[PDB]
Amino acid sequence: MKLERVTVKNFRSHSDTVVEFKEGINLIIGQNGSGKSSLLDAILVGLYWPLRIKDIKKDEFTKVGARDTYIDLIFEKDGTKYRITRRFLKGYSSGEIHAMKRLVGNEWKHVTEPSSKAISAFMEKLIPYNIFLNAIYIRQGQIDAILESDEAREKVVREVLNKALAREAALSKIGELASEIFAEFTEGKYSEVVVRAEENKVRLFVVWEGKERPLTFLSGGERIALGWAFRLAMSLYLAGEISLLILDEPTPRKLITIMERYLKKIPQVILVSHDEELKDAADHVIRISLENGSSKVEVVS
Numbered sequence: 001m002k003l004e005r006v007t008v009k010n011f012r013s014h015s016d017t018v019v020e021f022k023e024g025i026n027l028i029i030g031q032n033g034s035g036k037s038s039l040l041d042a043i044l045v046g047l048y049w050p051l052r053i054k055d056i057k058k059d060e061f062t063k064v065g066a067r068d069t070y071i072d073l074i075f076e077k078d079g080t081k082y083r084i085t086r087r088f089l090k091g092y093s094s095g096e097i098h099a100m101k102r103l104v105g106n107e108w109k110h111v112t113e114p115s116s117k118a119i120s121a122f123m124e125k126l127i128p129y130n131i132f133l134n135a136i137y138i139r140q141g142q143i144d145a146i147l148e149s150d151e152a153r154e155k156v157v158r159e160v161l162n163k164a165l166a167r168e169a170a171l172s173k174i175g176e177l178a179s180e181i182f183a184e185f186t187e188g189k190y191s192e193v194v195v196r197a198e199e200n201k202v203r204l205f206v207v208w209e210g211k212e213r214p215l216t217f218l219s220g221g222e223r224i225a226l227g228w229a230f231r232l233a234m235s236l237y238l239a240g241e242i243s244l245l246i247l248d249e250p251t252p253r254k255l256i257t258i259m260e261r262y263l264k265k266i267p268q269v270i271l272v273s274h275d276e277e278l279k280d281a282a283d284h285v286i287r288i289s290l291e292n293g294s295s296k297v298e299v300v301s
Helices: 035-049 116-126 129-136 142-148 151-162 163-185 220-239 254-261 276-281
Strands: 002-007 017-020 022-029 069-078 080-089 095-104 107-110 191-196 201-208 211-213 244-247 266-271 284-291 294-297
Touching: 002 035, 002 266, 017 284, 017 294, 022 276, 035 069, 035 080, 035 116, 035 129, 035 266, 095 116, 129 151, 129 220, 129 244, 142 151, 142 220, 151 163, 151 201, 151 220, 163 191, 163 220, 163 254, 191 220, 201 220, 220 254, 254 276
Parallel strands: 022 266, 022 284, 244 266
Antiparallel strands: 002 017, 002 069, 069 080, 080 095, 095 107, 191 201, 201 211, 284 294
8 A cells, every 4th residue: 555645634633734655765844842742633634534453532523613624645556546535524514425446547436335334344354444544553652552561561572463362373483574674674683583571471582692682782773673583573463464554753773774674674654753874774754843833844855
Protein backbone atom coordinates (compact mmCIF):
# COMPACT_ATOMS: atom_id res chain seq x y z
CA MET A 1 0.00 0.00 0.00
CA LYS A 2 1.22 3.47 -0.95
CA LEU A 3 -0.41 6.63 0.39
CA GLU A 4 -0.58 9.43 -2.16
CA ARG A 5 -2.62 12.38 -0.88
CA VAL A 6 -4.38 13.19 2.39
CA THR A 7 -6.86 16.02 2.86
CA VAL A 8 -8.21 16.82 6.33
CA LYS A 9 -10.65 19.66 6.97
CA ASN A 10 -11.95 20.68 10.39
CA PHE A 11 -10.51 17.86 12.48
CA ARG A 12 -8.76 19.06 15.64
CA SER A 13 -6.15 21.68 14.65
CA HIS A 14 -6.46 20.74 10.97
CA SER A 15 -8.81 23.30 9.43
CA ASP A 16 -7.58 22.66 5.89
CA THR A 17 -4.57 20.35 5.64
CA VAL A 18 -3.41 18.80 2.36
CA VAL A 19 -0.36 16.53 2.28
CA GLU A 20 1.21 14.78 -0.71
CA PHE A 21 3.09 11.55 0.03
CA LYS A 22 5.69 9.96 -2.24
CA GLU A 23 7.96 6.92 -2.45
CA GLY A 24 10.68 6.39 0.14
CA ILE A 25 10.94 8.09 3.52
CA ASN A 26 8.46 10.94 3.99
CA LEU A 27 9.41 13.08 6.98
CA ILE A 28 6.69 15.20 8.57
CA ILE A 29 8.56 17.69 10.74
CA GLY A 30 7.50 20.44 13.13
CA GLN A 31 7.49 21.63 16.74
CA ASN A 32 5.39 20.02 19.47
CA GLY A 33 1.68 20.73 19.13
CA SER A 34 1.76 21.16 15.36
CA GLY A 35 -0.78 18.37 14.78
CA LYS A 36 1.35 15.65 13.16
CA SER A 37 0.15 12.71 15.25
CA SER A 38 -3.41 13.94 14.69
CA LEU A 39 -2.84 13.91 10.93
CA LEU A 40 -1.71 10.30 11.31
CA ASP A 41 -4.85 9.62 13.37
CA ALA A 42 -6.88 11.25 10.60
CA ILE A 43 -5.31 8.90 8.05
CA LEU A 44 -6.06 5.89 10.28
CA VAL A 45 -9.70 6.84 10.91
CA GLY A 46 -10.02 7.78 7.25
CA LEU A 47 -8.97 4.25 6.37
CA TYR A 48 -10.79 2.25 9.05
CA TRP A 49 -13.92 4.15 10.15
CA PRO A 50 -16.02 3.24 12.10
CA LEU A 51 -13.60 0.83 13.82
CA ARG A 52 -11.95 2.06 17.01
CA ILE A 53 -8.58 3.75 16.55
CA LYS A 54 -6.87 4.08 19.93
CA ASP A 55 -9.33 5.86 22.26
CA ILE A 56 -10.59 8.27 19.61
CA LYS A 57 -14.33 8.91 19.88
CA LYS A 58 -16.53 9.32 16.80
CA ASP A 59 -17.72 12.60 18.33
CA GLU A 60 -14.48 14.28 17.25
CA PHE A 61 -15.62 13.75 13.65
CA THR A 62 -19.41 13.91 13.90
CA LYS A 63 -20.19 16.54 16.55
CA VAL A 64 -17.52 19.29 16.58
CA GLY A 65 -18.34 22.74 15.21
CA ALA A 66 -20.67 23.87 12.43
CA ARG A 67 -18.43 23.29 9.41
CA ASP A 68 -18.24 19.89 7.73
CA THR A 69 -15.52 17.50 8.84
CA TYR A 70 -13.85 16.14 5.71
CA ILE A 71 -11.40 13.26 5.31
CA ASP A 72 -10.14 12.38 1.83
CA LEU A 73 -7.49 9.70 1.37
CA ILE A 74 -5.97 8.70 -1.96
CA PHE A 75 -3.73 5.63 -2.02
CA GLU A 76 -2.49 2.82 -4.27
CA LYS A 77 -2.56 -0.93 -3.68
CA ASP A 78 -1.61 -3.63 -6.19
CA GLY A 79 -1.72 -1.31 -9.19
CA THR A 80 -5.13 0.16 -8.38
CA LYS A 81 -5.50 3.71 -7.07
CA TYR A 82 -8.26 4.06 -4.46
CA ARG A 83 -9.88 7.13 -2.92
CA ILE A 84 -11.84 7.19 0.35
CA THR A 85 -13.99 10.23 1.13
CA ARG A 86 -15.78 10.79 4.43
CA ARG A 87 -17.94 13.86 5.06
CA PHE A 88 -19.51 14.65 8.44
CA LEU A 89 -22.17 17.37 8.43
CA LYS A 90 -23.13 19.35 11.52
CA GLY A 91 -26.04 21.39 12.87
CA TYR A 92 -29.78 20.74 12.73
CA SER A 93 -29.50 18.63 9.57
CA SER A 94 -26.46 16.58 10.58
CA GLY A 95 -25.35 13.30 9.02
CA GLU A 96 -22.56 11.29 7.39
CA ILE A 97 -21.58 10.57 3.80
CA HIS A 98 -18.99 7.90 3.03
CA ALA A 99 -17.58 6.87 -0.33
CA MET A 100 -14.77 4.68 -1.65
CA LYS A 101 -13.88 4.87 -5.33
CA ARG A 102 -11.16 3.60 -7.65
CA LEU A 103 -9.57 5.34 -10.62
CA VAL A 104 -10.66 4.00 -14.00
CA GLY A 105 -8.72 5.94 -16.61
CA ASN A 106 -9.14 9.48 -15.31
CA GLU A 107 -12.49 9.05 -13.54
CA TRP A 108 -13.37 7.85 -10.05
CA LYS A 109 -15.91 5.03 -9.75
CA HIS A 110 -17.47 3.41 -6.67
CA VAL A 111 -15.86 0.13 -5.58
CA THR A 112 -18.91 -0.61 -3.44
CA GLU A 113 -22.05 0.88 -1.91
CA PRO A 114 -21.44 4.39 -0.53
CA SER A 115 -21.98 3.42 3.12
CA SER A 116 -19.85 2.91 6.22
CA LYS A 117 -20.57 -0.82 6.49
CA ALA A 118 -19.86 -1.67 2.85
CA ILE A 119 -16.69 0.42 2.69
CA SER A 120 -15.58 -1.18 5.95
CA ALA A 121 -16.30 -4.62 4.49
CA PHE A 122 -14.27 -3.76 1.38
CA MET A 123 -11.36 -2.38 3.41
CA GLU A 124 -11.38 -5.56 5.50
CA LYS A 125 -10.68 -7.43 2.25
CA LEU A 126 -8.20 -4.85 0.95
CA ILE A 127 -6.13 -4.56 4.16
CA PRO A 128 -7.47 -6.19 7.38
CA TYR A 129 -7.83 -3.85 10.36
CA ASN A 130 -5.37 -5.50 12.75
CA ILE A 131 -2.71 -5.55 10.01
CA PHE A 132 -2.62 -1.78 9.55
CA LEU A 133 -2.97 -0.85 13.21
CA ASN A 134 -0.15 -3.22 14.20
CA ALA A 135 2.05 -4.10 11.20
CA ILE A 136 1.93 -0.79 9.34
CA TYR A 137 1.28 1.64 12.20
CA ILE A 138 4.02 1.83 14.83
CA ARG A 139 2.37 3.61 17.76
CA GLN A 140 4.56 5.75 20.02
CA GLY A 141 5.69 4.04 23.22
CA GLN A 142 5.79 0.47 21.91
CA ILE A 143 9.59 0.38 21.53
CA ASP A 144 10.09 1.77 25.04
CA ALA A 145 7.58 -0.73 26.38
CA ILE A 146 9.46 -3.49 24.54
CA LEU A 147 12.68 -2.24 26.14
CA GLU A 148 11.01 -1.38 29.46
CA SER A 149 10.65 -4.84 31.02
CA ASP A 150 9.44 -8.41 30.49
CA GLU A 151 5.91 -7.62 31.67
CA ALA A 152 5.73 -4.48 29.53
CA ARG A 153 7.18 -6.42 26.59
CA GLU A 154 4.50 -9.05 27.16
CA LYS A 155 1.95 -6.22 27.12
CA VAL A 156 3.31 -4.91 23.81
CA VAL A 157 3.32 -8.35 22.20
CA ARG A 158 -0.21 -9.07 23.43
CA GLU A 159 -1.32 -5.68 22.13
CA VAL A 160 0.35 -5.95 18.71
CA LEU A 161 -0.42 -9.58 17.86
CA ASN A 162 -3.95 -10.28 19.12
CA LYS A 163 -3.94 -20.55 23.61
CA ALA A 164 -0.20 -20.37 24.33
CA LEU A 165 0.38 -22.94 21.58
CA ALA A 166 0.20 -20.17 18.98
CA ARG A 167 1.94 -17.74 21.34
CA GLU A 168 5.07 -19.91 21.49
CA ALA A 169 5.27 -20.45 17.72
CA ALA A 170 4.57 -16.77 17.10
CA LEU A 171 7.33 -15.71 19.49
CA SER A 172 9.67 -18.29 17.94
CA LYS A 173 9.06 -16.94 14.42
CA ILE A 174 9.33 -13.36 15.69
CA GLY A 175 12.51 -14.53 17.40
CA GLU A 176 13.92 -15.71 14.07
CA LEU A 177 12.91 -12.54 12.21
CA ALA A 178 14.20 -10.37 15.05
CA SER A 179 17.48 -12.28 14.97
CA GLU A 180 17.73 -11.63 11.24
CA ILE A 181 16.98 -7.90 11.57
CA PHE A 182 19.11 -7.32 14.68
CA ALA A 183 21.91 -9.14 12.89
CA GLU A 184 21.65 -6.46 10.20
CA PHE A 185 21.36 -3.57 12.66
CA THR A 186 24.53 -4.54 14.54
CA GLU A 187 26.31 -5.56 11.32
CA GLY A 188 26.70 -9.19 12.38
CA LYS A 189 27.94 -8.49 15.90
CA TYR A 190 24.95 -10.55 17.00
CA SER A 191 23.07 -13.20 15.00
CA GLU A 192 20.49 -14.58 17.42
CA VAL A 193 17.93 -12.95 19.70
CA VAL A 194 16.06 -15.31 22.03
CA VAL A 195 12.39 -14.64 22.77
CA ARG A 196 11.26 -16.85 25.65
CA ALA A 197 7.61 -17.15 26.68
CA GLU A 198 6.49 -17.51 30.30
CA GLU A 199 3.55 -16.78 32.60
CA ASN A 200 2.73 -13.18 31.64
CA LYS A 201 6.40 -12.49 30.91
CA VAL A 202 8.26 -12.37 27.59
CA ARG A 203 12.03 -12.59 28.06
CA LEU A 204 14.38 -11.17 25.43
CA PHE A 205 18.03 -12.21 25.22
CA VAL A 206 20.97 -11.65 22.89
CA VAL A 207 23.60 -14.34 22.32
CA TRP A 208 27.25 -13.49 22.97
CA GLU A 209 30.07 -16.06 22.92
CA GLY A 210 27.38 -18.74 22.79
CA LYS A 211 25.92 -17.63 26.12
CA GLU A 212 22.74 -15.57 26.39
CA ARG A 213 22.74 -12.01 27.74
CA PRO A 214 19.98 -9.60 28.82
CA LEU A 215 19.18 -6.04 27.70
CA THR A 216 21.70 -4.43 30.04
CA PHE A 217 24.50 -6.38 28.33
CA LEU A 218 24.02 -4.10 25.32
CA SER A 219 25.04 -0.53 24.54
CA GLY A 220 22.55 2.35 24.42
CA GLY A 221 22.15 2.14 20.65
CA GLU A 222 22.12 -1.65 20.61
CA ARG A 223 19.08 -1.70 22.91
CA ILE A 224 17.01 0.70 20.79
CA ALA A 225 18.22 -1.21 17.74
CA LEU A 226 16.99 -4.41 19.39
CA GLY A 227 13.64 -2.83 20.23
CA TRP A 228 13.17 -1.68 16.65
CA ALA A 229 14.28 -5.10 15.38
CA PHE A 230 11.70 -6.77 17.62
CA ARG A 231 8.84 -4.42 16.69
CA LEU A 232 9.65 -4.67 12.97
CA ALA A 233 9.91 -8.44 13.38
CA MET A 234 6.39 -8.43 14.81
CA SER A 235 5.15 -6.29 11.91
CA LEU A 236 6.78 -8.67 9.43
CA TYR A 237 5.25 -11.60 11.31
CA LEU A 238 1.80 -10.02 11.01
CA ALA A 239 1.93 -8.83 7.39
CA GLY A 240 4.33 -11.36 5.86
CA GLU A 241 6.06 -8.39 4.22
CA ILE A 242 6.68 -4.69 4.90
CA SER A 243 5.57 -2.35 2.12
CA LEU A 244 4.41 0.57 4.27
CA LEU A 245 5.46 1.86 7.69
CA ILE A 246 3.77 4.73 9.51
CA LEU A 247 5.99 5.75 12.41
CA ASP A 248 4.53 7.86 15.19
CA GLU A 249 7.08 10.14 16.87
CA PRO A 250 9.98 8.10 18.28
CA THR A 251 11.05 9.18 21.77
CA PRO A 252 13.73 11.92 21.79
CA ARG A 253 21.09 9.01 17.38
CA LYS A 254 20.85 5.39 16.20
CA LEU A 255 17.54 6.37 14.60
CA ILE A 256 19.57 8.07 11.86
CA THR A 257 21.44 4.86 11.02
CA ILE A 258 18.25 2.80 11.32
CA MET A 259 16.66 5.20 8.83
CA GLU A 260 19.66 5.30 6.50
CA ARG A 261 20.25 1.54 6.42
CA TYR A 262 16.90 -0.20 6.89
CA LEU A 263 13.92 2.10 6.33
CA LYS A 264 15.19 3.37 2.97
CA LYS A 265 14.78 -0.18 1.65
CA ILE A 266 11.04 0.02 2.36
CA PRO A 267 8.75 1.19 -0.49
CA GLN A 268 7.14 3.93 1.62
CA VAL A 269 7.73 5.24 5.14
CA ILE A 270 5.77 7.99 6.89
CA LEU A 271 7.75 9.43 9.80
CA VAL A 272 6.62 12.11 12.26
CA SER A 273 9.17 13.98 14.40
CA HIS A 274 10.35 17.38 15.68
CA ASP A 275 14.01 16.43 15.22
CA GLU A 276 15.62 18.48 12.45
CA GLU A 277 18.55 16.04 12.36
CA LEU A 278 16.33 13.53 10.54
CA LYS A 279 15.81 15.79 7.52
CA ASP A 280 18.96 14.53 5.78
CA ALA A 281 17.83 10.93 6.29
CA ALA A 282 14.49 11.52 4.55
CA ASP A 283 13.69 11.38 0.84
CA HIS A 284 10.88 13.91 1.18
CA VAL A 285 10.41 16.61 3.82
CA ILE A 286 7.03 18.07 4.78
CA ARG A 287 7.08 20.85 7.37
CA ILE A 288 4.01 21.47 9.52
CA SER A 289 3.47 24.30 12.00
CA LEU A 290 0.74 25.68 14.27
CA GLU A 291 -0.35 29.16 13.17
CA ASN A 292 -3.42 31.17 14.21
CA GLY A 293 -4.69 28.05 15.96
CA SER A 294 -4.50 25.91 12.81
CA SER A 295 -1.95 23.51 11.35
CA LYS A 296 -0.11 24.84 8.30
CA VAL A 297 1.81 22.77 5.75
CA GLU A 298 4.80 23.59 3.57
CA VAL A 299 6.73 21.25 1.27
CA VAL A 300 10.52 21.29 1.50
CA SER A 301 11.56 18.18 -0.43
